[PDB]
Swiss-Prot record, chains A, B:
Homooctamer. Present with 11600 molecules/cell in log phase SD medium. It comes from the Eukaryota. It comes from Saccharomyces cerevisiae (strain ATCC 204508 / S288c) (Baker's yeast). Disulfide bonds: none annotated. Belongs to the ALAD family. This is Delta-aminolevulinic acid dehydratase. Catalyzes an early step in the biosynthesis of tetrapyrroles. Binds two molecules of 5-aminolevulinate per subunit, each at a distinct site, and catalyzes their condensation to form porphobilinogen.
Length: 49, 49
């Protein structure tokens, strides 16, 4: 019978763990290099004669 | 009579001109590498027993 195989593992390496930095909604905002604000928006206008 | 002296000048060098980038309120905001938002604030709390 085909059974689920699990390879022998080694203790987790600290350098592998990145998950601690984006497991929460607020965190995903903190991870942004720049946050989108209304004053960054430039609206184009097509003025006719 | 002491009069205001003005030294002979050379044409303005383009590389000298930085003023075009912050002569307006909005521009001073655009010049910011990061804008301050409410979600960047962390308020400390002193919980007593």
């Amino acid at each position: 019978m085909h059974t689920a195989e699990f390879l022998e593992t080694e203790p987790t390496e600290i350098s592998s763990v990145l998950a601690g930095g984006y497991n929460h909604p607020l965190l995903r905002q903190w991870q942004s290099e720049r946050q989108l604000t209304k004053n960054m928006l430039i609206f184009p206008l097509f003025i006719s004669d």
